[PDB]
Design a protein around this ligand. Structure first.
Ligand SMILES: *[C@@H]1O[C@H](CO)[C@@H](O)[C@H](O)[C@H]1NC(C)=O
Ligand SMILES: *[C@@H]1O[C@H](CO)[C@@H](O)[C@H](O)[C@H]1NC(C)=O
Ligand SMILES: *[C@@H]1O[C@H](CO)[C@@H](O)[C@H](O)[C@H]1NC(C)=O
Ligand SMILES: *[C@H]1O[C@H](CO)[C@H](O)[C@H](O)[C@H]1NC(C)=O
Lengths: 252, 33
């Protein structure tokens, strides 16, 4: 048996949240349950963690503390996390991984989409298997090349459509959480469960081309395009698999 | 301004408020830091 300190268990508490958000596939929660009883006076069950996530991102009202609890607005104290914040972000940092997550009270409107309702149903169609970064023309992707920031930004407008990294070190930015990705495959997105599955409605892939590990960074994704008119003022969505090279180019 | 309906169609501004639809807005503005 080993007892965890305040900061030790808080990092494990954030590792639990990062895991439930499906930003990580691994966790270190050994000793978290006892830490929740000793420091929060409650059983931080999986139901409790869903409520913390659900409140912090969607339904939380008032000020929030470092452990995602909400409150409506001398002598030593045993109870921690009594300092709350009206709006802003929490550095959900487990030591092994971190994500800068914004409270739902910090957005003018809900920036999460209910993918249980808005799951995509797109029809494949003929299209170039290779797409040039300067000539991306997709409904789900808007690309900006900032030569002064030494950066490329890929605005993803349909997060339901996977964007797969290949030899990339990127930073994801959104109105939900900001975090770094360096592993091949589909971009991981924070998942909030609230009577359905919620993910960011939009996000941005920021690729530092100054970083030599991005020299061969490539995105594999479907390019969503507008099709034929089916109803009054609406067109059915189409998509084609394509490869977008980002890291390449020329110097000087 | 892009409107996605039933995850399978894209509609113009008029039907942006219809059932099963949601809208993605491009924001262009200045703000105080
Ligand atoms: C999310 O969508 C599902 C499927 O349409 C629906 O049952 C559920 O009520 C929605 N959740 C919220 C919180 O609106
Ligand atoms: C990206 O990977 C996912 C698996 O997560 C797969 O379903 C999808 O087809 C891939 N996309 C492309 C364009 O290959
Ligand atoms: C989405 O599907 C529902 C159920 O079939 C239908 O009532 C609605 O009109 C559809 N929306 C559009 C914009 O076609
Ligand atoms: C205890 O609570 C008070 C609230 O007035 C302060 O936040 C103080 O720093 C806390 N101390 C500890 C050790 O958590």
């Amino acid at each position: 048996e080993i007892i965890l300190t305040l900061s030790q268990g808080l990092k494990k508490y954030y590792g639990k949240i990062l895991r439930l958000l499906q930003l990580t596939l691994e966790e270190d929660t050994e000793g978290l349950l006892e830490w929740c009883k000793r420091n929060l006076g409650l059983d931080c069950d999986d139901t409790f963690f869903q409520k913390r996530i659900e409140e912090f991102f969607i339904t939380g009202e008032g000020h929030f503390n470092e452990v995602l609890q909400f409150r409506t607005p001398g002598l030593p104290t045993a109870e921690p996390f009594k300092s709350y914040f009206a709006k802003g972000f929490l550095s959900i940092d487990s030591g092994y991984y971190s994500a800068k997550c914004y409270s739902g009270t910090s957005n003018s409107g809900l920036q999460l989409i209910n993918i249980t309702r808005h799951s995509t149903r797109i029809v494949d169609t003929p299209g170039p298997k290779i797409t040039n970064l300067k000539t991306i023309n997709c409904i789900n992707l808007k690309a900006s090349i900032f030569k002064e920031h030494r950066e490329v930004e890929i605005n993803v407008l349909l997060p339901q459509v996977a964007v797969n990294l290949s030899n990339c070190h990127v930073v994801i930015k959104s109105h939900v959480c900001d975090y770094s990705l360096d592993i091949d495959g589909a971009v991981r997105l924070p998942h909030i469960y609230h009577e359905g599955v919620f993910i960011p409605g939009t996000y941005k892939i920021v690729i530092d081309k100054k970083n030599k590990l991005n020299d061969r960074c490539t995105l594999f994704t479907d390019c969503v395009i507008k099709g034929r008119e089916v109803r009054k003022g609406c067109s059915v969505l189409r998509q084609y698999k394509t490869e977008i090279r980002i890291g390449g180019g020329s110097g000087g | 301004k892009i409107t996605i309906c039933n995850g399978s169609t894209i509609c113009d501004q008029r039907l942006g408020s219809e059932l099963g639809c949601y809208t993605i807005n491009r924001v262009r503005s200045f703000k105080l830091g």
